[PDB]
Design a protein around this nucleic acid. Structure first.
Ligand SMILES: [Mg+2]
Ligand SMILES: [Mg+2]
Ligand SMILES: [Mg+2]
Ligand SMILES: [Mg+2]
Ligand SMILES: [Mg+2]
Ligand SMILES: [Mg+2]
Ligand SMILES: [Mg+2]
Lengths: 240, 93
RNA sequence: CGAGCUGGAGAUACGCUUUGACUCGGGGAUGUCCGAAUGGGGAAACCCACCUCGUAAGAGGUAUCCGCAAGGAUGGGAACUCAGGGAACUGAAACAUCUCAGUACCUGAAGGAGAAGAAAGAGAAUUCGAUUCCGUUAGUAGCGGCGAGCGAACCCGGAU
RNA sequence: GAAACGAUGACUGAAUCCGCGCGGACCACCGCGCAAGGCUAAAUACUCCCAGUGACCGAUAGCGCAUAGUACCGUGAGGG
RNA sequence: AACGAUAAAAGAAGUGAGAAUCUUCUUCGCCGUAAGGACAAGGGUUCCUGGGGAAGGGUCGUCCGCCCAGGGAAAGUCGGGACCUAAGGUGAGGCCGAACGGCGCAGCCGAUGGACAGCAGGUCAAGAUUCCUGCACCGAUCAUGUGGAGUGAUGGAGGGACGCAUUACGCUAUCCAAUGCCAAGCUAUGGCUAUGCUGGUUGGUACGCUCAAGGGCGAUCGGGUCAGAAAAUCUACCGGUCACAUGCCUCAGACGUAUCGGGAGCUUCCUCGGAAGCGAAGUUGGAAACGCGACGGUGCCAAGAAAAGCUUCUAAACGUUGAAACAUGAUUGCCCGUACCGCAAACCGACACAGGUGUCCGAGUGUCAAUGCACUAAGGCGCGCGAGAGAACCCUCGUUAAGGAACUUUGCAAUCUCACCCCGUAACUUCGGAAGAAGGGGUCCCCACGCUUCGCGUGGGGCGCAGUGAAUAGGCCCAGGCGACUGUUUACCAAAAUCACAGCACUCUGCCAACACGAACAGUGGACGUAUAGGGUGUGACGCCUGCCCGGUGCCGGAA
């Protein structure tokens, strides 16, 4: 049980319900996690403890850097209490060390991957997710992201050795409605159980369906929702 | 100034018997706070107040005439003086 | 002004008045608190401060936007004026262009009025000579699912 | 529309008085004007308020009121 | 027609023009986890006193929550402000927008949370942690004395700081019992003559070598600057030195002593009923919190506000000749709330309306237990028409010969069953269940003996038609459809086979994500998340499974 900030609940924007469903669940305080790790380069840290920290799905390791500054870090699958850890270019590719992709070997499994130097971790953060290094290009490294997509991440971006913790959300089977409620409000309200007024599927006389669409107009099974943007150049082979 | 503030003394059977124990009651300005009320009595009567308690009082009448009526609005201050009590000759009343 | 007055209040008491009350004109001086509201806060009319002078009482100051400053501005107006924005019912015996109509409404700015105004003009006389307003031209010329229907201007006569 | 002229959001972007704009595509000729700077009384519109008048009303009329935006209704706008 | 719940009433005495209805006495009946009592909201003088008697009061009023007049409401310590922050609101500057305006960091506003000093009694007709009496406490300013030097932000750190379930030990509030104590008298109907009957049986404070469960705590010298913007003697980290039991520190509460208080009643006067004076006893044993000791123990996953006050640090600063702190005087003590109604005749419901309304206290006997059920204390009330009669019919009830579903759309309705203990218990199954299956027996009173008690067990005896003797109080079973299950819904004709659900799938989305709100190159939600995540569609536990057709339509992919 250790220090953090309060994460007050909210399911609607500066007015009305914008992200559908979302509502119940326990109180939960926000724990500040170290995603950047750069300002602690060269300083060694000891894994004080791993902790149950909601807001995440992935475990959290309580780190103590020899200077006195205690920081929380995404605990990776394998990290134990007492195991030392360091950040920077001058840092070994060992369990829990933060080092840019240029110093990171090929085929070597990583997580907490950035996208722009500084900013912080943005890829493979959930438990069990990992990015595997494919092979260095120019001032960019090709990687295999959790989805299966290949991205050009510029070598200068930090990473953490190993796959993310919390083994597997598998034996977690919820079981009863209300385990869902311990977290988020009655989800999936069928649009076919709605009225012509309410949603496009809604209406008719009994059980049905006729054209396949979401809440508003669109269509959902197979329809490229992606834009014709810049980031497409720093990307290779999408599908799955 | 002094001489304003304390509008009138409190008449009633309870104020007259409170008098008999050196305790004086007045209808004062509803805005005239305890300290200002303390000073005004102290000066105008030439006596020291050892304690002061006060409270605001509402109104509302009509006998006849569709003139729904209206309030009046007071504040009643009740003071106790140190051992050598009495106020003027307007205490024996 | 010249004997009354003491508000409607018709009610008793106290009184005031030719050393000119009362009422009528016209200027002053007071003018709590809220309200643009303006020290800060606020569920108007309440709560809480700081500065300066001051014998305590008490008096003055503490909003933002223009500009050296002087000095100006915020808010309020029944309708009328111009501007930004701008419907539908309705009519077309249905309706979509069209109509209702740049009407209703909202919003901004302002005044006792405003707007507009001193020809890169009107129009065919090598006439006129800033603008507005009224008469008339004239339901003309023209517009128009050339349908419903819409509808000028010059000339000339006047207000100025 | 044969649709000129004004105006202008986007993109362009001239001449300087043997110059420039217009005269209902457009060209010639004839004719009327000086843009891209500003100010401006008067006649005109209205009626919160005041006065005068009326083949206007006179208490179910005339303003909603012989005075009330009250009583009363409504959470409120509002209605009365 | 009705006069607003079937919780009653009776008589006597009084008052008055007038009395079923107002007052007083004596009974009666009704509530008593309430129909008693204390708030909050809301209402606004309805409160008390004297008077009234037109309307209001479903009747009558001599009365009232009505009408008139007078009065009553007292705070340094209670609640709110002069303190703090949450959601939210606002917001100089800053980001957008035809106008009006929309956002938005710090800050500010905002309690429903944090913080913080007073307890016991007395008493107006009507106020009381507010007034009076007794004795406290808090802050500030100053006077005196001790101290003899530091004080220690707008900043740092510690602290405030927080779940759900279950539970060990001590306690108190509070409750019971008795041939404990104290007080008052008397009783007789047949008895008792007190070992009967009735009532009362200790609060505040101070001091105390007295008994005491339970709760709380490491101390100090160092090292790195790379951590807290900087500094720190503070805090974090690593290390060295004594950390078993103990050891410190605090004492819920009990006991003793003293003192102020209260205390059953007794007493004197009385303008009819109050006022004043006095004042006994303080036991032994049992029970006992949701309160207190306490931030205790254990277990669990869904992982349980912030900010100020507070404590500790240094920056700046004034300073060491007059410090901070302690101690004893004195002085000081602002504003608003405080009556009354407040599960209701004073609030919301047009109505003195069978409805609704958040919190707290809520006694005794009996009953495994209990805030259930019956009766009942304290207390409150008999519901603002009444009186007769004893028809049809209608409503709410009790019993019912013989029969027992023949009723009917349908056992609709109403019976039967009904608590606790012992015995006993089926198919089927997901191995939990089905189960309170089904069915049987016990149940009161006395005495003896045995034992873990309020008690229970064995034995013998007694009484009635009958012993959970009244009240509360499952009828059960076989088979099928649908839906797995708990759950949700049509406020006011539909509770369901609807919706949701755990689980499955297709699919989209690489992050300024897809998607969604929006004047908007604003802002925001998805998400302080990141593909073991998020959107959308469908199916709907679990088991076995999920086939054929790609022509048309849509979606993805090709391009000569
Ligand atoms: Mg008449
Ligand atoms: Mg009027
Ligand atoms: Mg905000
Ligand atoms: Mg009867
Ligand atoms: Mg007869
Ligand atoms: Mg079958
Ligand atoms: Mg079901």
């Amino acid at each position: 049980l250790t220090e953090a900030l309060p994460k007050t609940g909210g399911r609607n924007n500066r007015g009305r319900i914008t992200s559908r469903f979302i509502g119940g669940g326990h109180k939960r305080l926000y724990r500040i996690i170290d995603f950047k790790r750069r300002d602690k380069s060269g300083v060694n840290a000891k894994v004080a403890a791993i902790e149950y920290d909601p807001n995440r799905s992935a475990r959290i390791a309580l780190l103590h850097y020899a200077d006195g500054e205690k920081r929380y870090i995404l605990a990776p699958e394998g990290l134990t209490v007492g195991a030392t850890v360091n950040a920077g270019p001058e840092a070994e590719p060992k369990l829990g060390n933060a080092l840019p992709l240029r110093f990171v070997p090929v085929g070597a499994v990583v997580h907490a991957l950035e996208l722009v130097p500084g900013k912080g971790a943005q890829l493979a953060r959930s438990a069990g997710t990992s990015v595997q290094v494919q092979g260095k290009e120019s001032d960019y490294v090709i990687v295999r992201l959790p989805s299966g997509e290949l991205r050009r991440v510029h070598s200068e971006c930090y990473a953490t050795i190993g796959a993310v913790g919390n083994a597997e959300h598998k034996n977690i089977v919820l079981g009863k409605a209300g385990r869902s409620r311990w977290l988020g409000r009655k989800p999936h309200q069928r649009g076919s159980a709605m009225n012509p007024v309410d949603h496009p599927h809604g209406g008719g006389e009994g059980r049905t369906g006729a054209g396949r669409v979401p809440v508003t107009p669109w269509g959902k099974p197979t329809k490229g929702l992606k834009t014709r943007r810049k980031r497409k150049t720093s990307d290779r082979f999408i599908v799955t | 100034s002094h001489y304003d503030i304390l509008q009138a003394p409190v008449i009633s059977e309870k104020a007259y018997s409170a008098m008999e124990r050196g305790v004086y009651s007045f209808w004062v300005s509803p805005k005239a706070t305890k300290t200002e009320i303390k000073d005004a009595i102290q000066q105008a009567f030439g006596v020291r107040v050892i304690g002061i308690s006060t409270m605001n009082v509402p109104g509302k009448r009509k006998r006849v005439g569709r003139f729904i009526g209206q309030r009046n609005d007071r504040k009643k201050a009740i003071v106790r003086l140190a051992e050598g009590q009495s106020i003027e000759a307007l205490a024996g009343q």
